[PDB]
Amino acid sequence: MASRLLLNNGAKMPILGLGTWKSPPGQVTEAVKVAIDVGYRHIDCAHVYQNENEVGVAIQEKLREQVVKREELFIVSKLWCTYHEKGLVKGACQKTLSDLKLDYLDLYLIHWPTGFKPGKEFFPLDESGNVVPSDTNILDTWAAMEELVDEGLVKAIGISNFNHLQVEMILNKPGLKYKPAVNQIECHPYLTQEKLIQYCQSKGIVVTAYSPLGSPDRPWAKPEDPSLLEDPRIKAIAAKHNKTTAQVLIRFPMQRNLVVIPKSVTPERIAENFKVFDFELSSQDMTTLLSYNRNWRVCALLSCTSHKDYPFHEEF
Ligand SMILES: NC(=O)c1ccc[n+]([C@@H]2O[C@H](COP(=O)([O-])OP(=O)(O)OC[C@H]3O[C@@H](n4cnc5c(N)ncnc54)[C@H](OP(=O)(O)O)[C@@H]3O)[C@@H](O)[C@H]2O)c1
Numbered sequence: 390m391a392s393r394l395l396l397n398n399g400a401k402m403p404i405l406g407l408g409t410w411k412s413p414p415g416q417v418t419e420a421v422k423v424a425i426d427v428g429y430r431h432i433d434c435a436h437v438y439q440n441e442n443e444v445g446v447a448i449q450e451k452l453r454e455q456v457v458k459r460e461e462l463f464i465v466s467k468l469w470c471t472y473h474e475k476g477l478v479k480g481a482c483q484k485t486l487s488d489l490k491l492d493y494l495d496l497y498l499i500h501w502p503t504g505f506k507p508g509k510e511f512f513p514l515d516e517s518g519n520v521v522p523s524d525t526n527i528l529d530t531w532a533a534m535e536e537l538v539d540e541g542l543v544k545a546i547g548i549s550n551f552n553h554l555q556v557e558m559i560l561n562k563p564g565l566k567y568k569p570a571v572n573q574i575e576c577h578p579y580l581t582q583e584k585l586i587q588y589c590q591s592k593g594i595v596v597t598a599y600s601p602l603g604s605p606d607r608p609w610a611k612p613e614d615p616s617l618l619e620d621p622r623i624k625a626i627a628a629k630h631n632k633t634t635a636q637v638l639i640r641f642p643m644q645r646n647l648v649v650i651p652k653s654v655t656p657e658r659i660a661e662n663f664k665v666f667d668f669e670l671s672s673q674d675m676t677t678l679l680s681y682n683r684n685w686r687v688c689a690l691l692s693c694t695s696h697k698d699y700p701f702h703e704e705f
């Protein structure tokens with residue numbers, strides 16, 4: 390199929406990108422270099438991952454080497470929860486731009502819908518371990534994001550981990566100037582997100598699927614959690630196509646018209662994950678993979694469940 394999807398701003402976003410959460414600073418530079426060489430043109434970043442400077446070094450080297458031109462790359466970062474206050478949004482964006490060594494971002498996302506107390510700590514906690522919320526509401530944060538488009542810092546703005554009521558709040562904002570281009574959410578065969586995806590797609594919002602392999606390096610993994618990569622039913626579908634299970638898990642969201650951003654720092658796996666354009670899962674394989682849904686979420690956090698804007702109390 391097409392390798393890019395059209396956003397509501399007229400820009401084309403590559404459907405496969407490289408994730409960078411948990412990529413150590415001493416390895417992410419090489420990872421990104423190898424990815425660009427092999428053909429990736431979309432990199433998913435965030436300030437909170439604490440490695441944007443090192444991503445930036447990789448991007449600059451490949452621009453300087455003339456392997457790629459800036460306009461061919463699609464670089465995404467995210468506004469952290471401690472910067473939801475209207476006056477802090479621009480500064481947070483500029484810090485990211487400085488670390489990545491760029492003069493504009495292609496897409497800037499609100500990372501989570503919940504605002505936290507501003508400060509140096511990414512997760513400010515109270516004396517009993519609850520996250521300290523800020524009194525900012527998401528509509529005011531959105532207005533600040535829209536000003537970054539007008540100022541030329543970012544080409545498109547979007548959201549991440551927003552449920553459908555939270556998306557609706559933005560779409561019904563008085564004076565809405567730029568609709569969200571993308572909603573980046575957790576999506577894989579154990580959390581298929583049919584309802585939320587259909588909602589978003591109906592509204593012309595592109596969905597990006599994160600943790601498509603089930604994030605087996607997540608820091609809070611437990612020894613007897615489910616493993617997608619070792620699910621024997623998925624292994625059988627892979628075997629039938631002579632692909633790896635990872636390749637099947639990456640191709641899956643592509644055929645649902647989603648963008649997908651697997652993470653790897655391993656050069657062989659970076660190349661393997663890119664070889665997904667030469668095969669098709671059947672309708673039958675797609676429906677079967679959808680049937681494996683268990684509403685199991687990698688990305689959730691108990692310390693934040695008391696926040697009024699925590700997204701996962703809703704059905705979708
Ligand atoms: N918006 C948000 O809230 C949100 C939250 C979570 C994730 N994200 C984004 O989504 C990206 C992807 O999600 P994720 O990092 O949670 O995990 P993921 O991409 O589902 O899985 C990463 C794990 O899979 C391993 N892996 C990669 N390709 C493989 C292959 N071909 N065979 C076997 N193992 C393979 C990686 O190993 P190696 O690295 O050792 O090779 C790593 O341990 C993140 O990096 C981040 O950019 C955004």
Ligand SMILES: O=C(O)COc1cc(F)ccc1C(=S)NCc1ccc(Br)cc1F
Nearest residue numbers: 410435437438439501502503688689690693
């Ligand atoms: O968030 C990422 O992209 C990947 O995850 C993270 C990435 C980081 F670099 C630091 C913490 C997280 C965590 S703990 N994310 C879980 C989480 C954070 C805030 C809220 Br509201 C709910 C929630 F579930």
